[PDB]
Design a protein around this ligand. Structure first.
Ligand code: CHL
Ligand code: CHL
Ligand code: CHL
Ligand code: CHL
Ligand code: CHL
Ligand code: CHL
Ligand code: CHL
Ligand code: CHL
Ligand SMILES: CCCCCCCCCCCCCCCC(=O)OC[C@H](COP(=O)(O)OC[C@@H](O)CO)OC(=O)CCCCCCCCCCCCCCC
Ligand SMILES: CC1=C(C/C=C(\C)CCC[C@H](C)CCC[C@H](C)CCCC(C)C)C(=O)c2ccccc2C1=O
Ligand code: SF4
Ligand code: SF4
Ligand code: SF4
Lengths: 31, 73, 73, 41, 60, 163, 80, 143, 741
């Protein structure tokens, strides 16, 4: 049974939030 | 050396020909001819003048690794 | 799921291929007579591990991926 | 003759004579006793 | 300290540490390393002599 | 190790037969009494003698029909394989100790000369021949020097790098 | 710039100063050795780091020591 | 003794030019000038490649590096027995006199020089690198 | 002023006193060793005569007598080659049947099982098959018996002993003075007219009087034992006139300038003898006669003692122009006072000559049954190519040595050398750009083809059936040389070679020579050759031009020709010396010549060599060069993987020595990388630990063990690299072409 498009968009949004947190940690480690 | 040993002994075991490792690993020409030369025939034919197949990415990466290795020299 | 049904006669798929530099014989060779388009056949053995630990469907793998993304965040 | 024998005593000449003797001894042993694999008679 | 007396070098960074050399001369004007020692072997620079202080050489 | 004696191994006999057959196939292109015919016949005789000697030596053969050596001193002694590794081990160790003791004695003798470096590249050939002949009795002198404490230099007399 | 230090084992043989290609070293008066002079390194901003001075030093171990540090235009030997 | 001043009207050696000379670094960062007084007109080897003819009397050569000037001065002292002076010139026009710094060559001991970089110990008496951790020093040679 | 013999009587006493003192020639090395570096320094400085002394006369005398020693060694080697042909060969049987009998002149002794290398080469004989081509050379000379090979072997050893005598005599008894050696005008006159001219005339005489009638009878089918001996043709003029009827007229046509009567044995046929596949021997006799006359004329150019003639100094000083300053002024003084400049010029031209010889010997094979002996053809091409490349690298080395040691700026002001040094940055930068452009537009074509083929797009490839790169200039040259007997050389019956076009020359069912067509793959590989040669030139020329100074190290000449570095400063100055440029140029020449010999081997196996049957020509690899040599994968598979099957399955046959050497050469090449990739500080510290172990047991040597010097580490690395790679290709080539040829 294949995934749905909404599931992929949900995963992309969660990964975008994770990327925002990654940028925050990278800035905090830099300075 | 370790992974060459693992791969050749298991290749002989998986092909059902245990005697190939037993009768050719005792000398280094056996290693060269019956492991490197013999088992690279399908890999280097991944693309040829007659066409290509699914191993063509591995032939290209094979040459790619040879080139990167040479550039380090 | 197709690998779960036939673990001895199905090659596990790593991910899809989208390469605009591909020619048509490259598209058909990496399709391997399937319907998912050009794919890479996985060598990592994640299919056997995930099958052994009880995952069966694509939904379970997707839920695990979402959970691990949340854990990374 | 002293200088000539001193030249023959230099390290490459002595090495040539010694390795010629050793290689010849091994060759003639393997000629007189062909194919020695074990210490068995 | 004497002339042509065997001494053992106690300087750890010296090439001839724990080795025996011959005293060439001892300077008497109060310089920092007055003992001049000749060694039978050369160091990596091809030098066979070095200067040592009184505490860096032990008579053997 | 699951091996069979080479005197009763079928692979050993098959290998002898195949090698003799190949040499005889090469032999039939030359006339009798010619130099290639005599050389090939001598090779055939050497092949037969070698296979007979390997069978008679009690060598163990694997499934490949080739002799396998036994190097454990226990299995070699209780099954008659000491001539494969153990006796060669004793012979090599004797000759190697001979060579090492002769070299050490030559170095120590040259150390006492006015130009110790001169004897290292211009060999004192009579002295080297005398010292070389005296290396036959190396284990007695070496074991005595080990017991006496004269074999080893003291650690206080050897240079070291700073730690 | 590289750091050049002179240790008190210097015998004042002036060989390091003569070996220097960029005029980093000089001899100053001293009293710790028989030659009554010691090497000094007042111009280490011009030191390229070639270690010709260490090759010229006869003491064991070296009396002149060059420690490669931060690289500038002069220390990298750049004409451009 | 006083430091000499650079005379920019000093004639240059007879040279046909080369590709090994000054670059943009001379205009924007620094360059170097070596002056010497030749006893006679003769051919010398340029440090940047090729043969040049030095004129009798004073000479002036502009070079990209201090090492080039000192190599030329070594050639002049060893081959032609001629002393020389080396200056550093900045793009704003400021001229810094370099060599010989006090008028005496550095290989000859001269009074009035102060030792810099001297350590009052042998090189084996340097401390361990664990003793200079989190101190800001360059190394055990810096303490 | 006056050219004359001047020697010094008994300059050096003949004694064994210095034989007992290694390093006697050197001021530093005569004191004896302190470390193990002295052992290597003694061998490294043994032939650097200019380092031993600054006196040019002593250097010249040493060079002269060393050259006599080299000539004696070469004559010993040649006499041994003739002796092994006389005593340990199947040369007479091969003479009776040169098609089905493989040449062999090495027999191994039966011990430790090595008699398997005595292969069944034919002729009732067992031995190692040889690829040097001596049999075909001896047949072309007219040698028909082992006795004549014995006579040449004995006469060569007598001349070898005369050469060794002359070297002793001209150093220890009558050593010529410096002004004798500096008679370059007399040397050129004697070496052009007397060495080359009289040598070519004497060899034309041998060819006419011996080689032509014996080979004519051999190609007519006469048994070699029934052919009259050469002196029978010398003494009996009627026996000569039976084969060449113009000999009945004697020397009268020569002296009455009726030279066209000699047209039966002085020909201009061109092409190849259809019976033997070699060049016509009458053509070669006319060639050597014409060359002899030309060189005898050329040797009368320079003024020695009778007013007439040219002064080389005047010619050099008169050749100057507006762009070039003083021109060639001062070059005469350089070339009469520096042995290294002369060695650079002569090594460059000799190496280029060796490569030209390789190409001309494959294309126009001058020996009978040479062309159908594919092993010999491949071997002599590859050998002479390698000798040429090594000599060219040596030319770069000794040009750099001249620049460091013998260059004087006082004697070179505004001449060509000075002006070349003064724009070295422009030369090096432009050559660097040319090398980058050539590398991109040659190797990137192969990478593009490999990517296109791997992407399933063969229509986007650079190929004959795709985007074409036709070498149109070379094709036009081939067509011009094919049409030469029509208009531009009407007296030539045939083109110089069958490679220009035309028919297939077949000998014994095998191709001797045939047209070599050039397509896209030939274009690509020729531009690869151009790129690799340009990079090797860049390295060697950069080493020569910056040997004395650079912007990095302005006093590099004071550091010498051969030094490791100038320390870790200025960012790091490893390998700045001109010696290190020679060291890198050796690798690049190896790369270039490896591609050249691979191109030769694949192209002749694919498009020339093969079996001529009734239908046509079936080549060895079946014409797969034009299909697959446009990719790196095609090279690796169809040449390297496919053609190495003979050397890896050679075990148990007479070619098994080639398999062993294949493995051992791979080993030696790999062994070289430990010297090349590492540095001597590690090895010195490891030696310190090992020395501690030896000091503990009182076995530490008095000669203190040191790691190799940095330069020696580089030299050992490059020597083992070259030996391993070249011997790998040697075993692969020889096993492949002996088994399939
Ligand atoms: C220095 C090493 C050396 C030793 C210990 C021997 C030992 C021997 N050789 Mg040998 N040879 C040696 C080097 C060489 N030999 C020979 C050529 C010969 C020949 C031709 C013969 C011997 C023979 C002999 C035997 C009687 C003498 C004896 C076993 C003889 C033999 O084989 O038995 C009587 C005999 O005929 N040798 C050559 C030239 C290739 C050598 C180098
Ligand atoms: C460390 C590696 C190594 C070892 C243990 C051996 C061991 C042996 N080899 Mg092998 N070899 C080895 C490396 C190599 N071999 C060879 C090439 C060969 C060949 C071609 C042959 C051997 C043979 C032999 C045998 C010789 C016995 C003998 O002569 O007794 C003599 C004993 C003495 C001389 C003792 C001294 C007594 C004193 C004079 C009194 C022996 C089994 C021979 C054998 O027939 O195979 C089994 C043989 O024909 N070796 C090469 C390439 C050069 C090597 C590298
Ligand atoms: C590397 C060292 C080494 C190893 C791993 C072995 C291994 C072995 N030995 Mg050997 N040996 C070894 C060195 C030596 N052994 C021997 C003398 C013997 C004897 C006399 C015997 C063994 C036996 C054995 C076997 C059973 C031993 C045991 O512990 O039974 C629990 C086993 C295969 C036995 C046997 O031969 O096989 C069962 C046995 O009887 N060894 C000597 C001489 C002092 C050695 C040195
Ligand atoms: C007098 C000769 C001599 C003796 C008694 C020793 C003894 C020793 N070596 Mg040293 N070596 C000797 C010569 C030489 N060694 C070396 C290079 C090394 C290395 C690199 C190492 C040793 C190590 C060792 C130790 C372990 C045994 C070994 O590894 O052998 C191996 C020996 C070799 C690989 C070289 C042997 C060459 C030859 C067979 C010996 C020389 C013979 C003499 C020329 C004979 C002259 C006598 C005449 C004139 C009467 C042991 C202390 C190892 C170590 O330190 O262990 C703790 C170690 O790693 N040796 C060279 C340069 C190739 C030599 C010449
Ligand atoms: C480039 C020169 C050259 C080379 C590479 C060879 C190579 C060889 N020769 Mg030929 N030769 C050469 C020049 C000459 N040879 C000969 C006359 C011979 C003969 C008569 C024989 C060889 C033999 C051999 C082989 C064995 C040699 C040996 O084992 O020495 C042995 C090593 C020793 C140290 C002993 C030397 C004893 C000698 C009396 C002094 C070897 C392939 C043999 C042959 O080819 O195999 C059947 C052989 O019988 N050579 C002459 C005329 C004098 C030459 C000039
Ligand atoms: C027995 C005859 C004989 C004797 C006693 C001497 C004696 C001497 N020679 Mg004269 N020579 C002799 C014959 C010959 N000489 C010469 C040409 C020269 C030159 C050009 C020079 C001498 C020099 C010397 C002196 C010391 C150098 C030396 O000999 O190292 C011995 C060196 C060897 C034994 C090396 C071996 C070389 C040999 C040609 C083998 C070639 C390689 C092999 C093919 C192996 C390759 C692998 C010494 C006075 C030198 C001098 O006077 O002072 C510096 C000098 O420059 N000789 C030739 C022509 C090559 C000869 C034949
Ligand atoms: C006509 C040819 C020719 C002549 C007369 C010379 C002459 C000279 N060369 Mg030039 N060279 C020549 C051609 C070539 N040169 C060079 C590149 C160089 C360099 C880079 C240097 C010279 C140097 C020298 C000088 C000292 C050489 C010496 O002492 O050898 C000593 C010889 C040895 C120590 C042995 C060399 C062995 C060789 C590296 C490996 C041999 C492998 C074997 C052929 C095959 C395998 C053998 C077996 C045993 C494994 C001398 C002026 C040196 C000098 O300093 O300049 C003044 C120097 O640094 N030459 C190459 C490219 C490789 C040439 C071809
Ligand atoms: C395969 C190994 C190898 C490669 C690729 C190179 C590369 C190069 N060498 Mg080295 N070398 C290599 C082996 C070795 N070289 C040397 C020592 C030297 C010397 C001494 C010199 C060189 C020079 C050169 C350059 C020749 C000019 C050129 O062709 O530019 C074109 C570049 C290539 C042909 C490389 C392949 C590029 C490819 C065709 C295009 C790829 C483009 C990418 C697809 C785009 C990027 C996309 C990515 C980023 C997403 C080039 C940079 C010479 C030089 O620097 O001056 C001109 C020079 O003097 N090499 C040694 C030790 C002896 C080697 C072992
Ligand atoms: C096929 C080979 C590759 C050809 C193209 C490569 C060009 C690479 C070199 C750059 C050109 C630089 C010319 C500067 C050199 C320069 O001084 O030019 C002037 C040069 C000589 O002029 P003069 O009349 O001063 O010469 C008097 C001479 O007797 C003394 O050298 O004449 C040329 O134009 C040479 C021809 C350049 C073409 C070379 C082609 C070789 C065939
Ligand atoms: C391995 C290696 C070494 C170590 C190699 C050494 C010291 C050479 C050893 C050669 C021989 C084997 C040493 C002994 C020579 C004697 C003359 C042999 C006597 C032995 C008898 C049997 C004849 C270096 O010194 C080195 C230096 C610079 C760059 C790379 C390297 C490098 O790679
Ligand atoms: S490293 Fe070089 S530049 Fe620096 S002081 Fe030493 S010699 Fe002078
Ligand atoms: S070379 Fe060394 S000992 Fe001599 S003056 Fe310089 S620092 Fe002192
Ligand atoms: S690494 Fe070696 S070659 Fe490079 S600068 Fe340092 S000492 Fe010189």
């Amino acid at each position: 049974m294949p995934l749905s498009d909404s599931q992929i968009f949900i995963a992309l949004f969660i990964a975008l939030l994770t990327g925002i947190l990654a940028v925050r940690l990278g800035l905090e480690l830099y300075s | 050396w370790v992974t060459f040993y693992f791969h050749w002994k298991h290749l002989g075991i998986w092909q059902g020909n245990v005697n190939q490792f037993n009768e050719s690993s005792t000398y280094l020409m056996g290693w060269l001819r019956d492991y490197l030369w013999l088992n690279s025939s399908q890999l280097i034919n991944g693309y040829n003048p007659f066409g290509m197949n699914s191993l063509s990415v591995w032939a290209w990466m094979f040459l790619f690794g040879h080139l990167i290795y040479a550039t380090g020299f | 799921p197709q690998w779960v049904q036939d673990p001895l006669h199905v090659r596990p798929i790593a991910h899809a291929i989208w390469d605009p530099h591909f020619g048509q014989p490259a598209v058909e060779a990496f399709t391997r007579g399937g319907a998912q388009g050009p794919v890479n056949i996985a060598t990592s053995g994640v299919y056997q591990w995930w099958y052994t630990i009880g995952l069966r469907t694509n939904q379970d793998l997707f839920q695990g991926s979402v959970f691990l993304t949340i854990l990374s965040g | 003759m002293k200088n000539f024998t001193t030249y023959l005593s230099t390290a490459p000449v002595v090495a040539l004579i010694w390795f010629t003797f050793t290689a010849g001894l091994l060759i003639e042993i393997n000629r007189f006793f062909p194919d020695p694999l074990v210490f068995s008679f | 300290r004497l002339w042509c007396v065997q001494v053992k070098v106690l300087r750890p960074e010296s090439y001839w540490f724990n080795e025996v050399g011959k005293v060439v001369s001892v300077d008497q004007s109060g310089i920092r390393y007055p003992v001049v020692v000749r060694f039978p072997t050369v160091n990596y620079a091809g030098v066979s002599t070095n200067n040592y202080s009184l505490e860096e050489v032990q008579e053997v | 190790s699951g091996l069979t004696p080479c005197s009763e191994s079928k692979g050993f006999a098959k290998r002898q037969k195949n090698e003799i057959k190949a040499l005889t196939k090469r032999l039939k292109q030359y006339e009798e009494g010619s130099a290639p015919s005599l050389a090939l016949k001598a090779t055939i005789e050497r092949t037969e003698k070698r296979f007979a000697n390997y069978g008679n030596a009690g060598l163990l053969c694997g499934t490949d029909g080739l002799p396998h050596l036994i190097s454990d001193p226990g299995l070699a002694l209780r099954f008659g394989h000491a001539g494969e590794t153990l006796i060669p081990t004793v012979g090599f160790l004797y000759i190697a100790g001979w060579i090492g003791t002769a070299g050490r004695d030559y170095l120590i003798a040259s150390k006492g000369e006015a130009k110790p470096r001169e004897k290292e590249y211009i060999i004192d050939v009579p002295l080297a021949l005398k010292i070389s002949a005296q290396g036959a009795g190396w284990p007695f002198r070496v074991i005595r020097e080990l017991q006496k404490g004269t074999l080893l230099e003291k650690d206080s007399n050897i240079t070291v790098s700073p730690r | 710039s590289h750091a050049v230090k002179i240790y008190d084992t210097c015998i004042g043989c002036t060989q390091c100063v003569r070996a220097c290609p960029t005029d980093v070293l000089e001899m100053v008066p001293w009293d710790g050795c028989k030659a009554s002079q010691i090497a000094s390194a007042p111009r280490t901003e011009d030191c390229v780091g070639c270690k010709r001075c260490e090759s010229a030093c006869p003491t064991d171990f070296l009396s002149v020591r060059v420690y490669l540090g931060s690289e500038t235009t002069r220390s990298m030997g750049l004409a451009y | 003794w006083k430091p000499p001043t650079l005379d920019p009207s000093t004639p240059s050696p007879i040279f046909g030019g080369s590709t090994g000379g000054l670059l943009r670094k001379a205009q924007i960062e620094e360059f170097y000038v070596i002056t010497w007084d030749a006893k006679k007109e003769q051919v010398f080897e340029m440090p940047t490649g090729g043969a040049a003819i030095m004129r009798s009397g004073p000479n002036l050569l502009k070079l990209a590096r201090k090492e080039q000037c000192l190599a030329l001065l070594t050639q002049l002292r060893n081959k032609f027995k001629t002393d020389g002076q080396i200056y550093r010139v900045f793009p704003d026009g400021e001229v810094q006199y370099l060599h010989p710094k006090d008028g005496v060559y550095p290989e000859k001991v001269n009074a009035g020089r102060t030792a810099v970089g001297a350590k009052d110990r042998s090189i084996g008496k340097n401390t361990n690198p664990v003793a200079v951790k989190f101190t800001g020093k360059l190394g055990t040679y810096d303490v | 002023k006056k050219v004359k013999i001047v020697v010094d009587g008994n300059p050096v006493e003949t004694s064994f006193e210095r034989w007992a003192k290694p390093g006697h020639f050197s001021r530093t090395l005569s004191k004896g060793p302190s470390t193990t570096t002295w052992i290597w320094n003694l061998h490294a400085d043994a032939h650097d005569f200019d380092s031993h002394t600054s006196d040019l006369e002593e250097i010249s005398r040493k060079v002269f007598s060393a050259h006599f020693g080299q000539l004696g060694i070469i004559l010993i080697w040649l006499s041994g080659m003739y002796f092994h042909g006389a005593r340990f060969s199947n040369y007479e049987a091969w003479l009776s049947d040169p098609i089905h009998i493989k040449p062999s002149a090495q027999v191994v002794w039966p011990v430790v099982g090595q008699e398997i290398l005595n292969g069944d080469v034919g002729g009732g004989f067992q031995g190692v098959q040889i690829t040097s081509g001596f049999f075909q050379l001896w047949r072309a000379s007219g040698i028909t018996s082992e006795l004549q090979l014995y006579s040449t072997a004995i006469g060569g050893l007598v001349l070898a002993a005369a050469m060794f005598f002359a070297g002793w005599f001209h150093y220890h008894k009558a050593a010529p003075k410096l002004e004798w050696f500096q008679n370059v005008e007399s040397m050129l006159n004697h070496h052009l007219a007397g060495l080359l001219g009289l040598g070519s005339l004497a060899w034309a005489g041998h060819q006419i009087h011996v080689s032509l009638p014996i080979n004519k009878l051999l190609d007519a089918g006469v048994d070699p034992k029934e052919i009259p001996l050469p002196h029978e043709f010398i003494l009996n003029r009627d026996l000569m006139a039976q084969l060449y009827p113009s000999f009945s007229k004697g020397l009268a046509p020569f002296f009455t300038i009726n030279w066209s009567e000699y047209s039966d044995f002085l020909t201009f046929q061109g092409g190849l003898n259809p019976v033997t596949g070699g060049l016509w021997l009458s053509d070669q006799a006319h060639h050597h006669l014409a060359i002899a006359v030309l060189f005898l004329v050329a040797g009368h150019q320079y003024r020695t003692n009778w007013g007439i003639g040219h002064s080389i100094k005047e010619i050099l000083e008169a050749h100057k122009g507006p762009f070039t300053g003083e021109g060639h002024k001062g070059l005469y003084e350089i070339l009469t006072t520096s042995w290294h400049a002369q060695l650079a010029i002569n090594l460059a031209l000799f190496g280029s000559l060796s490569i030209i010889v390789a190409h001309h010997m494959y294309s126009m094979p001058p020996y009978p049954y040479l062309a159908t002996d594919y092993g010999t053809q491949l071997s002599i091409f590859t050998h002479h190519t390698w000798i040429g490349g090594f000599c060219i690298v040596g030319a770069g080395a000794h040009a750099a040595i001249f620049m460091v040691r013998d260059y004087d700026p006082t004697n070179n002001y505004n001449n060509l050398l000075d002006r070349v040094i003064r724009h070295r940055d422009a030369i090096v930068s432009h050559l660097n750009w040319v090398c980058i452009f050539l590398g991109f537009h040659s190797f990137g074509l192969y990478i593009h083809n490999d990517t296109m083929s791997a992407l399933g797009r063969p229509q986007d490839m650079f190929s004959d059936t795709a985007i074409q790169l036709q070498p149109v200039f070379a094709q036009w040259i081939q067509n011009t040389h094919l049409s030469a007997p029509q208009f531009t050389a009407p007296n030539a019956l045939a083109p110089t070679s069958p490679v220009w076009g035309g028919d297939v020359v077949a000998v014994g069912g095998k191709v001797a020579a045939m047209p070599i067509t050039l397509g896209t793959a030939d274009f690509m590989v020729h531009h690869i050759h151009a790129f690799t040669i340009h990079v090797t030139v860049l390295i060697l020329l950069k080493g020569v031009l910056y040997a004395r100074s650079s912007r990095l190290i302005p006093d590099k000449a004071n550091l010498g020709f051969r030094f490791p570095c100038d320390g870790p400063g200025r960012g790091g100055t490893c390998q700045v010396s001109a010696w290190d440029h020679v060291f890198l140029g050796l690798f690049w020449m190896y790369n270039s010549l490896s591609i050249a010999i691979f191109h030769f081997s694949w192209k002749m196996q694919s498009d020339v060599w093969g079996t001529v049957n009734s239908t046509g020509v079936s080549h060895i690899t079946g014409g797969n060069f034009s299909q697959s040599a446009n990719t790196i994968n095609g090279w690796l598979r169809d040449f390297l993987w496919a053609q190495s099957s003979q050397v890896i399955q050679s075990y148990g046959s007479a070619l098994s020595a080639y398999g062993l050497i294949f493995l051992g050469a791979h080993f030696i090449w790999a062994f070289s990388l430990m010297f090349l990739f590492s540095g001597r500080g590690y090895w010195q510290e490891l030696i310190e630990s090992i020395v501690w172990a030896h000091n503990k047991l009182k076995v530490a040597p008095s000669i203190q063990p040191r790691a190799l010097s940095i330069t020696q580490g580089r030299a050992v690395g490059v020597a083992h690299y070259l030996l391993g790679g070249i011997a790998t290709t040697w075993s692969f080539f020889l096993a492949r072409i002996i088994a399939v040829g």
